[PDB]
Swiss-Prot record, chain A:
This is Small ribosomal subunit protein eS8. The keyword Membrane applies. It is found in: Cytoplasm; Membrane; Nucleus, Nucleolus. The modification N6-acetyllysine is found at K36, K127. Keywords: Acetylation, Cytoplasm, Isopeptide bond, Lipoprotein, Membrane, Myristate, Nucleus, Phosphoprotein, Ribonucleoprotein, Ribosomal protein, Ubl conjugation. Gene3D superfamilies: 3.10.290.70, Ribosomal protein S8e, subdomain. GO terms for molecular function: structural constituent of ribosome. The gene is RPS8. A lipid is attached at G1 (N-myristoyl glycine).
Curated annotation (Swiss-Prot), chain B:
It is found in: Cytoplasm; Nucleus, Nucleolus. It comes from the Eukaryota. This is Small ribosomal subunit protein uS17. Its main location: cytoplasm. Component of the small ribosomal subunit. Part of the small subunit (SSU) processome, composed of more than 70 proteins and the RNA chaperone small nucleolar RNA (snoRNA) U3. One of its GO terms (biological process) is translation. Component of the small ribosomal subunit. The ribosome is a large ribonucleoprotein complex responsible for the synthesis of proteins in the cell. Part of the small subunit (SSU) processome, first precursor of the small eukaryotic ribosomal subunit. During the assembly of the SSU processome in the nucleolus, many ribosome biogenesis factors, an RNA chaperone and ribosomal proteins associate with the nascent pre-rRNA and work in concert to generate RNA folding, modifications, rearrangements and cleavage as well as targeted degradation of pre-ribosomal RNA by the RNA exosome. Gene3D superfamilies: 2.40.50.1000. Belongs to the universal ribosomal protein uS17 family. Citrullinated by PADI4.
Curated annotation (Swiss-Prot), chain C:
This is Small ribosomal subunit protein eS4. The keyword Acetylation applies. Component of the small ribosomal subunit. Part of the small subunit (SSU) processome, composed of more than 70 proteins and the RNA chaperone small nucleolar RNA (snoRNA) U3. Identified in a IGF2BP1-dependent mRNP granule complex containing untranslated mRNAs. Keywords: Acetylation, Cytoplasm, Isopeptide bond, Nucleus, Ribonucleoprotein, Ribosomal protein, RNA-binding, rRNA-binding, Ubl conjugation. Residues 41-103 form the S4 RNA-binding domain.
Length: 206, 151, 262
RNA sequence: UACCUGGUUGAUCCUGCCAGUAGCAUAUGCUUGUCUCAAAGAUUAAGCCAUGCAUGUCUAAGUACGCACGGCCGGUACAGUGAAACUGCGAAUGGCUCAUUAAAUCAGUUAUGGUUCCUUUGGUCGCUCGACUUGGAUAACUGUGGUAAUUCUAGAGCUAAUACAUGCCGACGGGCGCUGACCCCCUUCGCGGGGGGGAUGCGUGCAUUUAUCAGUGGUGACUCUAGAUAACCUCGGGCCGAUCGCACGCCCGGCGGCGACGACCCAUUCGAACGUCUGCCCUAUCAACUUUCGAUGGUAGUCGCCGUGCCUACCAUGGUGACCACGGGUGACGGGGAAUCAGGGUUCGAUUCCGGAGAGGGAGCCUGAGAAACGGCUACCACAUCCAAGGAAGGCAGCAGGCGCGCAAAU
RNA sequence: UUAAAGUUGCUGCAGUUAAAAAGCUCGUAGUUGGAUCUUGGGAGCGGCCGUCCCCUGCUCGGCGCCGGCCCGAAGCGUUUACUUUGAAAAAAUUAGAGUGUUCAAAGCAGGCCGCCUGGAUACCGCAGCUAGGAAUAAUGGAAUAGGACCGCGGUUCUAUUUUGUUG
RNA sequence: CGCUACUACCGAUUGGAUGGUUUAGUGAGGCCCUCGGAUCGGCCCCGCCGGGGUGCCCUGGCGGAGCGCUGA
């Protein structure tokens, strides 16, 4: 019975308006999704026009973007760290649009060694043990090595992104509404976004 | 001067993190500015071109369109932020007594920070938009100064 | 009203449906189709009032689903089908065809045509669309989606379509110096030549149309149907050629006809 | 037809009111021969109802083993009609009333470049690179039962789909992009460089979502349509036909004509919905009103078909007002219109066409494209029916009719 | 309930004595506000005058010709009220055209011997959109010259048609 | 001042009643979420056969489900 009318409330002059007709069916409201984390549960509700909107209650993975060289991979949600709207909504593990979370760094790393052939992560004191990448390094011709060399002539990124890559988690943002389409898409935070939201987290946690 | 609140302010048309060859100087750190011609014979000003303010309801750098009616009014009060109230003085006619009466219907319009050379009494024109607030429906297209104020 | 209306009162009908008062409470509400409710004409209205082939509402139904009437090359079995501007209607057995053109007044008129002219139909393009795999599309004033048009068809042109294949044969470009007529408003059925076309940004773009005898009038952009390229019309015009005789000349013509008839 | 007459005085001239005069629509009284139209329980009671009716529906094309009927050579399947019942569609239209409602409704004018749309119409429906027809449940039916009682129903035995489901072959041999073992040509001796073939492996289109780049067609103007790259593609899951009938068949088992039904998307039709400008009766013995119980605006979200304090968390103190806000009253539904009328006006508009609101009055909801539906459902109170006293069943401001209320309104 | 009511008076009432100028004055909102800005002329008809034409500037082209003229136009021109035209403004109803329902209220019919028709028009207060004029009433140009105009002198960002093919 | 009638007014009875706003507390029913799992299906062993194929699979059941999986 949650309404979305514009006649329960006062006017511009401050005088009360008297309602003349009751609550209609196009005027409808529904309770909040409160999209948590966990094993994935998605419910469907019938809306006006007979269409369906996917209510994402819990979810595991997301399809994020990393725009420095335009790659997108399916990535697991790890933990939510910041929400610009409510400070309670970080204490309860909730997902909203334009929210600030941490995602795992493995598939972007695998794409980085598989495309640019430079090591990402792999902190000093422990080198590449399971012997897969130098197998791909070998048995090449001269033209293909020239093509990789001209590609990795410029292979620089931000140092904060590198520090997140040794840390194993990338700070990410959600650009999709999970209570309407049922998925959690978005893009990873880069550039001035990283320093701004890191300043916000270090100010709040202090 | 910018980035005041708890979220980042950006224009969702451009990409602000393009990867250059060097990421040093001499070609970087001048971000592009999104703007469009609103039409109806109106000309976009330079402050919307070279400015650094961020809006989502500005008619020039924003996601709002101009269609419908074009009105005019006189600026009365500048107290609430990023939006102003104008006064429209008009004459009403009575058939019985063949004599006019003046009436006023003040209403709130939106002022972007592009027009910051606005004082009380300046004549402005507005254009109809989608509802941007509870009582705000119009966006200011241009500003015209009143008499005096030669400084 | 919790849903769409399904009835239509007799005095709420449009005037160009051209009915009476003391016959019945209701009027034939047409089925939804290519044309609007206030701009079309039901098949029952035509067959029961204009051609006088039927007298009741059951005789029209018998003739309609007897498979005797063909609508733009397709047989229709709906008694309230919307028939509008230049809807070619054909009777196959007695060999008659009618073209629906607005006459000198604000109404429709019966106009028998030859079958060779009944094979095609002039219609107005409304908007230009681009499909999925880069296919240009045309939306026609009677909702005919045509794939792959001529590249020189613009927003307010007129195309001629054969009723057997659905393709474009020839077209008329929107320009001054072309024969035009108006569909709707105070002016209706007058045939004239476009002279001026005033552009107003953000509102209706009015035009100026001059008659063949010296009269001029102004209508909106949506109230335009281009029918000819120059002076020769591409279709057979009705009687009077759409000249809009005023009340004095109409009275003089009626008095002359009464005196000559005796 | 732009009009007057009697009454204050012993008599006169005036202000002034009373009473005459005319129409109009409610009642009542007296009277009444013909014919043609025509309002009619609205005022006081949006008070209460016994009874009967008002929403159902089959074609040459969804399902027919009821002999309920009927054709025959019965024996490779139905001549055909078919109540019943499953399925699908409509009941959200129409009809009645004026209780609420005073910038609310509504009227003229705009906009959806800020969204959904049953049906019809037109387009798309071998664009995707990976079975000569599958499964089990229920009707109708048979048989057997309970309750005083309802358009109430449980266990038992079969059986169908255009009901519920699971799903393939072809198109389909090669195209477009990444990875590419490798191979070949040369001044430059090779080295270094330039140019062509590429097996193998992965992804492929439309519908949704995110991120990046360029700028076929259009607008006064897009974060518009189209194009490219990288992915997503919900187990309550997008489509890409396991459907039906008529007329007959050509060419060596393959292959054909016209329809009916269903379907993702796109436009159109019917619209609906939210907004822009202007316009409503009286009252100051209502002069200030609203304001962390959102009042005004900004940021970011939730929800909603979409914009928006519609709602959340944080900020600033804003917003209206003597040009009458606010508060109260209304014997207030609004308009097109009606009566009178020289010229201006005054009064009415419950009432046949348009829009809005409700079905005792608030509240909540299933189904469905469209309902906060009441001749749909669920609880409260007022009122009320039947009964073996355990329970069961309803809302005539629909058509007739009855009571109450009345000056006042029919089969 | 309307006219009569010029007994609600905007057209259109009264205020010395018949009903009625606040005891007087200042004063905000309201209402109302002086003069003053382009006059006068020409080609001609009817014979000085009632009707005819003339006294805003600039980037592209079709009605005509021999880099040179006129015509037009993508695009701009101090804003209001008032005034005239144009669009749209549902029907019925109000005026109103036609028509022997035997007349009329009606109704949209009907008339010739298969043929010919009608089923118009006006009105629709105001507000929104447009196109000729600026008489009427109100605003503004420059006085601290941050006034026009003319050709010069310094500081910056960007366009493919070019310094022999290509970097 | 004396008499009759009527109209409203003040007023003890802090009289009676019909509508509305509201402090605080209770709150049926529906809706959403988290749980809950009565009941109903399908595959692998024991028992009988008729096997082509050259002691073993396709074919049909109940008693224990082995409370194993999975769906409503």
């Amino acid at each position: 019975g949650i309404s979305r009318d514009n006649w329960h409330k006062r006017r511009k002059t401050g005088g009360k308006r008297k309602p003349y007709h009751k609550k209609r069916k196009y005027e409808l409201g529904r309770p909040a999704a409160n999209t948590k984390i966990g094993p994935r549960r998605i419910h469907t509700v019938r809306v006006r026009g007979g269409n369906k909107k996917y209510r994402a209650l819990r979810l595991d993975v997301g399809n994020f973007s990393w725009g420095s060289e335009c790659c997108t991979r399916k990535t697991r949600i790890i933990d939510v760290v910041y929400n610009a709207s409510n400070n309670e909504l970080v204490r309860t593990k909730t997902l909203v649009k334009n929210c600030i979370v941490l995602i795992d760094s493995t598939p972007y790393r695998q794409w980085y060694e598989s495309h640019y052939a430079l090591p990402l992560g792999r902190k000093k004191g422990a080198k590449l043990t399971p012997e897969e990448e130098e197998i791909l390094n070998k048995k090449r011709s001269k033209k293909i090595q020239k093509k990789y060399d001209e590609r990795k002539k410029n292979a620089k990124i931000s140092s904060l992104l590198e520090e997140q890559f040794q840390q194993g988690k990338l700070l990410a943002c959600i650009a999709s509404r999970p209570g309407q389409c049922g998925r959690a898409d978005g893009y990873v935070l880069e550039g001035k976004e990283l320093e701004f939201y890191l300043r916000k987290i270090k100010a709040r946690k202090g | 001067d910018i980035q005041t609140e708890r979220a980042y302010q950006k224009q969702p048309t451009i990409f602000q993190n393009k990867k250059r060859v060097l990421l040093g100087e001499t070609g970087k750190e001048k971000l592009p500015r999104y703007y469009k011609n609103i039409g109806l014979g109106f000309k976009t000003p330079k402050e919307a071109i070279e400015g650094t303010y961020i809006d989502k309801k500005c008619p020039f750098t924003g996601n709002v369109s101009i269609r419908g009616r074009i009105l005019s009014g006189v600026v009365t009060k500048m107290k609430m932020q990023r939006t102003i109230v104008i006064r429209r003085d008009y004459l009403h006619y009575i058939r019985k007594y063949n004599r006019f009466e003046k009436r006023h219907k003040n209403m709130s319009v939106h002022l972007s920070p592009c027009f910051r050379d606005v004082q009380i009494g300046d004549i402005v024109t507005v254009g109809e938009c989608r509802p941007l607030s509870k009582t705000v429906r119009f966006n200011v297209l241009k500003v015209t100064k009143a008499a005096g104020t030669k400084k | 009203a919790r849903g769409p209306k399904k009835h239509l009162k007799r005095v709420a009908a449009p005037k160009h449906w051209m009915l009476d008062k003391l016959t019945g409470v209701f009027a034939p509400r047409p089925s939804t189709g290519p044309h609007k409710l206030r701009e079309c004409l039901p098949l029952i209205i035509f067959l029961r009032n204009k051609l006088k082939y039927a007298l009741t509402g059951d005789e029209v139904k018998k003739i309609c689903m007897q498979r005797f009437i063909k609508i733009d090359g397709k047989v229709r079995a709906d008694i309230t089908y919307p028939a509008g501007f230049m809807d070619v209607i054909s009777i196959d057995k007695t060999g008659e065809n009618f073209r629906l053109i607005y006459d000198t007044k604000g109404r429709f008129a019966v106009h028998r045509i030859t079958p060779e002219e009944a094979k095609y139909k002039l219609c107005k393009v409304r908007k230009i669309f681009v499909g999925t795999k880069g296919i240009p599309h045309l939306v026609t004033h009677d909702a005919r989606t045509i794939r792959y048009p001529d590249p020189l068809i613009k927003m307010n042109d007129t195309i001629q379509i054969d009723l057997e294949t659905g393709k474009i044969t020839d077209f008329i470009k929107f320009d001054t110096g072309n024969l035009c007529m108006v569909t709707g408003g105070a002016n209706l059925g007058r045939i004239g030549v476009i002279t001026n076309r005033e552009r107003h940004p953000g509102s209706f773009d009015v035009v100026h149309v001059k008659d063949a005898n010296g009269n001029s009038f102004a209508t909106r952009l949506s109230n335009i149907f281009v029918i000819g390229k120059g002076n020769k019309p591409w279709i057979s015009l009705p009687r009077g050629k759409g000249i809009r005789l005023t009340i004095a000349e109409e009275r003089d013509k009626r008095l002359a006809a009464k005196q000559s008839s005796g």
